[PDB]
Amino acid sequence: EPFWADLQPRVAFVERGGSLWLNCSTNCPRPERGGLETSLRRNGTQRGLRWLARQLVDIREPETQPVCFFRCARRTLQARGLIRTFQRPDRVELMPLPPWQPVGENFTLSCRVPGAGPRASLTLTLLRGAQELIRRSFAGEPPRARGAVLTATVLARREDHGANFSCRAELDLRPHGLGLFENSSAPRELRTFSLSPDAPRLAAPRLLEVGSERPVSCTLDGLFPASEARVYLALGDQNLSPDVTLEGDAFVATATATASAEQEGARQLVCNVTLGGENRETRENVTIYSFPAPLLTLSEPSVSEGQMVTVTCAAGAQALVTLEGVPAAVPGQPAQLQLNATENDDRRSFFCDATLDVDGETLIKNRSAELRVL
Ligand SMILES: *[C@@H]1O[C@H](CO)[C@@H](O[C@@H]2O[C@H](CO)[C@@H](O[C@@H]3O[C@H](CO)[C@@H](O)[C@H](O)[C@@H]3O)[C@H](O)[C@H]2NC(C)=O)[C@H](O)[C@H]1NC(C)=O
Ligand SMILES: *[C@@H]1O[C@H](CO)[C@@H](O[C@@H]2O[C@H](CO)[C@@H](O[C@@H]3O[C@H](CO)[C@@H](O)[C@H](O)[C@@H]3O)[C@H](O)[C@H]2NC(C)=O)[C@H](O)[C@H]1NC(C)=O
Ligand SMILES: *[C@@H]1O[C@H](CO)[C@@H](O[C@@H]2O[C@H](CO)[C@@H](O)[C@H](O)[C@H]2NC(C)=O)[C@H](O)[C@H]1NC(C)=O
Ligand SMILES: *[C@@H]1O[C@H](CO)[C@@H](O[C@@H]2O[C@H](CO)[C@@H](O)[C@H](O)[C@H]2NC(C)=O)[C@H](O)[C@H]1NC(C)=O
Ligand SMILES: *[C@@H]1O[C@H](CO)[C@@H](O[C@@H]2O[C@H](CO)[C@@H](O)[C@H](O)[C@H]2NC(C)=O)[C@H](O)[C@H]1NC(C)=O
Ligand SMILES: *[C@@H]1O[C@H](CO)[C@@H](O)[C@H](O)[C@H]1NC(C)=O
Ligand SMILES: *[C@@H]1O[C@H](CO)[C@@H](O)[C@H](O)[C@H]1NC(C)=O
Ligand SMILES: *[C@@H]1O[C@H](CO)[C@@H](O)[C@H](O)[C@H]1NC(C)=O
């Protein structure tokens, strides 16, 4: 039985910044020299015959090898040991995914667990809801190195809208006799959208008569989420309130649009829809007209018989006026038809036609009035 040196514990696993006791002993009856050699710290100490104890506090190093040495009978007697540290995955961070992610396009997922060690004992897993997307074990990494990073790129889908993404960090110390420490990051909700480059189809009449209700409709296709989409449809600068329903992935905006006049002779119909960070618009110009139908009025209601009269129309100097088939003569006016009253002319209808062209389209309206002859 020769002389020996013994320190306890031989190998010790202690949390980073923690503390532990080392008492180094020997069988030498009267050692001339003894002490503990390490790089870390001292808090308090307990010694005596054949053994000394040191309190190593605040351990900031991944791996250290404390050596306790003794001297008896002018010989060097030493003992070596091992102290390693770990760090819980207390801080786990997930990157701030884009506000709106296009459906059918890839996006990055990166879980970040800084400071956690040892790296080889870290198992990182990306989670969508309760489902595991990917599992990456870092086993085979240097024991000295800490921290872990897991990056994976997945495909944005339809269901991915309103779905939670997180990352689970597992530090497995179990084979070392300590245990398993796992902590999950903050779940992040994703919002996905798909907006077709196609322009919305707008159904509108070319001409709009004042005081008449002409229905208009603005629709599109392939919009998700459909309910999330906001739609504006109006007449010129005058706001409207379209009834909006949802047929499939398509929205249907339908309402009746009246005319005022107001202003002026022509305008545009504006329909635009903002979904997420993108928006589409279709503008169909529409000419607006007012039709002042000519008057059938007479110079005088009676006029017996034999006295001439002057008949007027007044389409408003726009349309070409024809009163009972006469191309008046002269234009820009309710131009006159001069007729001497006759008994045979009793109750004769005057046909007044007004031909007005707007935006290249011709419109006419007709009626008749009579005159009594005494
Ligand atoms: C989603 O992201 C992944 C990863 O960035 C990409 O998918 C990859 O797209 C490329 C382009 O077609 C391909 O990668 C490689 O293609 C060559 C042939 O050109 C082949 O020899 C390689 O083995 C590899 O497949 C491939 O389609 C695909 N690769 C994988 C592993 O998925 C792309 O950015 C996105 N995928 C889409 C949009 O489908
Ligand atoms: C996915 O994760 C998100 C958070 O990133 C979860 O949202 C959270 O849960 C619900 C919304 O579904 C909210 O519930 C709250 O309940 C309490 C008690 O009833 C009430 O006082 C609150 O006013 C609210 O209604 C909660 O606020 C919300 N948290 C945040 C920050 O928005 C979502 O639930 C997860 N998905 C699933 C399927 O669980
Ligand atoms: C470090 O080791 C020494 C080895 O001597 C321990 O001292 C012994 O303590 C036991 C207690 O069960 C006694 O029975 C022995 O008689 C002690 N040895 C001697 C030589 O007196 C010491 O206690 C250990 N340190 C700690 C903190 O336990
Ligand atoms: C390090 O020294 C501190 C004193 O600065 C020791 O603290 C004593 O013991 C416990 C543990 O912190 C405290 O609750 C007591 O109040 C402290 N005693 C006194 C008299 O102050 C501590 O034990 C030492 N060791 C470690 C590992 O911290
Ligand atoms: C949705 O419609 C509204 C109508 O009020 C648009 O508002 C104007 O649109 C023009 C052309 O896009 C802009 O130049 C003006 O600055 C807007 N002014 C106001 C007060 O909104 C709106 O722009 C349309 N949305 C999109 C994305 O075009
Ligand atoms: C889990 O990680 C979060 C990340 O911020 C941290 O705030 C929390 O203290 C951790 N919990 C435990 C028990 O480690
Ligand atoms: C509609 O009118 C606008 C002017 O307001 C004009 O720029 C545009 O070309 C017109 N549309 C067509 C198809 O001509
Ligand atoms: C006027 O005559 C045209 C052509 O005969 C006809 O289409 C139209 O209905 C008539 N107007 C009225 C109010 O009946």
Numbering used by the authors: 1 to 374
Verbatim from the authors:
In addition to integrin recognition shared with the other ICAMs, ICAM-5 has unique characteristics within the subfamily, as it mediates homophilic adhesion interactions that promote neurite development. The crystal structure of the four most N-terminal glycosylated domains (D1–D4) of ICAM-5 was determined in three different space groups and the D1–D5 fragment was modelled.
The largest movement between the most divergent R3 and P4322 structures (r.m.s.d. of 2.7 Å) was ∼16°. The overall P21 structure is nonetheless more similar to the R3 crystal structure (5°) than to the P4322 structure (11°), even though the tetragonal and monoclinic crystals were prepared under the same conditions.
